[PDB]
Amino acid sequence: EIRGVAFKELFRFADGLDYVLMGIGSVGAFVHGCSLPLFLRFFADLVNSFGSNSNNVEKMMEEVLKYALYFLVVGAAIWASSWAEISCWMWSGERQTTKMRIKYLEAALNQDIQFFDTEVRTSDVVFAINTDAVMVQDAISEKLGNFIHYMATFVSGFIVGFTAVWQLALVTLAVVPLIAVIGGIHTTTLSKLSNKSQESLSQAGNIVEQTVVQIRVVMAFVGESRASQAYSSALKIAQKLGYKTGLAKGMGLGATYFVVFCCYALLLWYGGYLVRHHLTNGGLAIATMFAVMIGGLALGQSAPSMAAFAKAKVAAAKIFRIIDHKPTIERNSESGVELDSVTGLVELKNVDFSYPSRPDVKILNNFCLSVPAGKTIALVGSSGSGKSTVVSLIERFYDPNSGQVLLDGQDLKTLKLRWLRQQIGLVSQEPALFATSIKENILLGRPDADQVEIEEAARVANAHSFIIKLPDGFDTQVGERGLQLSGGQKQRIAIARAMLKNPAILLLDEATSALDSESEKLVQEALDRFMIGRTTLIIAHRLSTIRKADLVAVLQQGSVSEIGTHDELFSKGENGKLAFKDQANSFWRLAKMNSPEWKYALLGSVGSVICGSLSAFFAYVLSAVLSVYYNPDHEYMIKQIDKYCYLLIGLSSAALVFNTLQHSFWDIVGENLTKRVREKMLSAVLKNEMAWFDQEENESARIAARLALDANNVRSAIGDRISVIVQNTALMLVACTAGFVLQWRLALVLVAVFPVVVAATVLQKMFMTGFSGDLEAAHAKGTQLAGEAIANVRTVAAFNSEAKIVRLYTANLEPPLKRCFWKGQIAGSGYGVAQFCLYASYALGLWYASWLVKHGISDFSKTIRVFMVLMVSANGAAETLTLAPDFIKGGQAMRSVFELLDRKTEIEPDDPDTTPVPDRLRGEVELKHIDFSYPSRPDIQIFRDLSLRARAGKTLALVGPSGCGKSSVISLIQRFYEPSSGRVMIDGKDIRKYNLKAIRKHIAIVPQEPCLFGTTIYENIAYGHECATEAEIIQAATLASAHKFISALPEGYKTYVGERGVQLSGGQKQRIAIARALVRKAEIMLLDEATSALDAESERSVQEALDQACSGRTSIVVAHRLSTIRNAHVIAVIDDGKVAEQGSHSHLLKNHPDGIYARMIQLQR
Ligand SMILES: CC(C)[C@H](C)[C@@H](O)[C@H](O)[C@@H](C)[C@H]1CC[C@H]2[C@@H]3COC(=O)[C@H]4C[C@H](O)[C@H](O)C[C@]4(C)[C@H]3CC[C@]12C
């Protein structure tokens, strides 16, 4: 484990402005922290004056006025301090982190390639840029300010409480730990249970992902229910964990309320005792209790900043480790001769390079390669030979071991590499394109070029292409949102960037196997014009360029064998605004969908209202006790205080019980709703046809992501919404009725500003969480550019364009900087305004209470009770709003799930219109005049009114060009896609009117790539038939010969096979797929060209298994390899969507000579 760097080093990249910002933010944070207990002290003074001066009205009025002015001053101070703190801390952190990001990327780019090979992985570098974008910035921007603020709040609260009433402060200090302890336990318990629920949800998502990637075989058979059952099990586990989560949350809230009620019972009694003995005032005691509570909670809230500091220390240690590293290979050297003879006569003698990470094995051991001066060389060394090692050595990526290696007669170390790499042009296996515009992606080959040179290079040496046939053209920033690039466009861009480096050698290598000939001919003309270009890593891919090269010296077993002529070369290298009515309707339909849980909801609802009442009740008690404090009759005050304390102790238990009840039952409602909706979504998805799966936004992990993300916000938007809207309604109703009954006038004035108080307290809690948004989302563009640069470090170094990448990174990072500055300003201003309005409302309400008392309208007791009850109830309501407010996201996901459910399938897997189905369908399939067009590409028509047919009980083999959709025929058979036109019949009955579900069990299919359903081979084989028992799969394995390795397998049938388990060989996987096909004992077998890339033993085994599989009943096979259709007695030709020759291969080979069969026979020779 790396040792975290000390805290001070985190501020390495701080300049003078950052120091000023940090100082101003620190002062603002200190003032913001201190001004809360100061407000409590001023409130105590105001209440004490307003209660003591009942007889002397004028003194009461003037003192209340001065303290209201103090409240306004404190509000203004809070406004200024919070604004300064938030803005300065956010912007300073962002600036420092951006500078450090830029320096990190700059240091990473100019590192040696061997650094990434051995020291730090590229994935580690990308993760490090994630960590520097998150943790270091978070610690030095928001966590530090919050730590200072909470230290200030803690110290100020303790000072205020002690200097007011040291006695009660000590008692309140002892009460603080209990509340803090319960809060910590509740938070930890929920986090642990949340982790359990999270992994359970991941399991459910994995099931959906697996089902979608295997949707073909799953739909081809009858696995739709099987998949739903597995999903049901995972959902059940998740809801059980959710039940625990909900019960734990309820218990935590109940426990903290119980402790709070009992502790304030004790504190209020002790405050009454102190008031009896003339040791304090009422307001002073109340403020002391509040201040000490605030200080303790502030320290508790400050601890997470320390946690963040530790994590960021570790992260910054890693980042500074990578930054401070110094490259070993010398760059910007002074030994460069800068020779103008760009032609490389001959070089690379006696190279003895050994791979840097592992010195045990060496490739370039003792041999020489040598080159001419202006003639290409083709290099073909086995398969895993060090063909790329020569390219790397030429580019000076590494260095040869102790020997004598030169270039052009002037060595490599004595020619620099800043301009040496300028002479050399490199084209990689896969072209490396960066997030900038394609125009700049042409520039970085030579920044000194102008527009005219770029366009002439792209035009005379490349054909007109998508760059000009484009809405944007030169300003076409690709990035992650790059347009459709099939490989040819980006490849041509890469060679163009290459030709901008006109002189000297140009290095080639193999491209993708499926590439158009235009790129190859452009490469050929590029190497012809730059005859200095040699060292093509063709690895036996273009015999024409091989004949072009004067020397085609090979690198067999990592060594040169023959150098010179290129004549025979045989037996070597044989490899080739949003609406609201719709939201209301969807809400109503989900509620109707949630009907079976109604009981729980009602009970939960009951608990909610009672919980709300308790909160209001608590507020009232405080008010009452305070109002009782300023009562001359001591015995009456004793009786009242005892009554209130006993009532509070009694109702603490009710608070606990009904908090647990409410949260448990609402969580049960929510979990049941999520499970039901998720199952319905999966069923609706599985009912859809394959054309729906082919469409975009509709495949693999992304559909699983939509399913996972559109259920939790649904549970929120139903359960949490109703729970809060009823509990806060009960709270507000009780508080408002108490306030009205006491003094309706002041109650009305206060409920005028009630939303302002609630909003301000909500913003206080949000400040507690933080106002910096998703830092990752802000720097997404820069992060992806940096990842592309680091992953493509070899290409960047080859084109010596590190500075260009750095400046592009800076230009991408500037808009996040500006956005962060403005966001900080807006957030600080808004928070300050809200707090100022809160304190202005407090001052106005309390002054109006004083004014009412002055004119004999009311009393001190009633007015103070109204004020305190309404304000504490506002705080409680805001604390209630802290529950997940994902309502808008909930509505959006509501619409998403509803449109997913209401989608209509064109092909219904079910058979509502039942048709007669024979028990043993013989299956005389006849695809007569079937006109089918590629679903993905309508223009492409694999079938053109082809009258294909196959007599039942007979084997038909489909042969023809790979381009024609011979496999697409089997898709039409399973009705995955419907032919653009034409009618297909299945044994005397058309399949359209026929029942698809009955057909599925009479059809067996083997995919070209076998797929792994689950853990055991047992279940994979049993998947073929609905009720496979045990003997049936035994015979399936024996006839399929799958048992041969199964007995050899340690666990046999029950071995864990798949991605994580024992990965069987391709032949074994295909053989078990064939076995599961035989399990279904279907009359019609649709054999696919699975035997594509296998070794000799696996080839023979899989063709044998195919021999037993196709034997018996009827089988439509598609094949392209000899000794496969020969066994079949009926062969068809798929030429251009039409049938050409029908009959046995031997029968049609004798007559009409030079036939299409003879064509592939001659080709296979
Ligand atoms: C005199 C008040 C009306 C004052 C003007 C008001 O603005 C102030 O913010 C009140 C509502 C605060 C000050 C201290 C707060 C309390 C702090 O002391 C406590 O024990 C905590 C524990 C726990 O966090 C409870 O959920 C809230 C609870 C019990 C708080 C409830 C709200 C307060 C009582």
Swiss-Prot record:
The chain crosses the membrane at residues 20-40, 71-91, 144-164, 165-185, 255-275, 279-299, 606-626, 646-666, 722-744, 746-768, 833-853, 868-888. Changing Y264A: Reduced brassinolide-triggered ATPase activity and altered brassinosteroid exporter activity. Strongly altered brassinosteroid exporter activity. Transport capacity is stimulated by the chaperone protein FKBP42/TWD1. Transport activity inhibited by 1-N-naphthylphthalamic acid (NPA), cyclopropyl propane dione (CPD), cyclosporin A, verapamil and quercetin. ATPase activity is specifically activated by bioactive brassinosteroids in a dose-dependent manner, including brassinolide (BL), 24-epiBL, 24-epicastasterone (24-epiCS) and castasterone-alkyne; BL binding leads to structural changes. Inhibited by vanadate. Its main location: membrane. It comes from the Eukaryota. Induction: By auxin. Induced by brassinosteroids (at protein level). GO terms for molecular function: ABC-type transporter activity; ATP binding; ATP hydrolysis activity; ATPase-coupled transmembrane transporter activity; auxin efflux transmembrane transporter activity; auxin influx transmembrane transporter activity. SUPFAM superfamilies: ABC transporter transmembrane region, P-loop containing nucleoside triphosphate hydrolases. Changing M871A: Slightly increased brassinolide-triggered ATPase activity. Brassinosteroid exporter that, in conjunction with ABCB19, supports the accumulation of exogenous brassinosteroids (BR) in the apoplast, thus promoting BR signaling initiation involving the specific receptor BRI1 and required for plant growth and stress responses. Auxin efflux transporter that acts as a negative regulator of light signaling to promote hypocotyl elongation. May contribute to the regulation of leaf position and morphology during PHOT1-mediated blue light responses involving auxin distribution, especially in low light fluence. This is ABC transporter B family member 1. It comes from Arabidopsis thaliana (Mouse-ear cress).
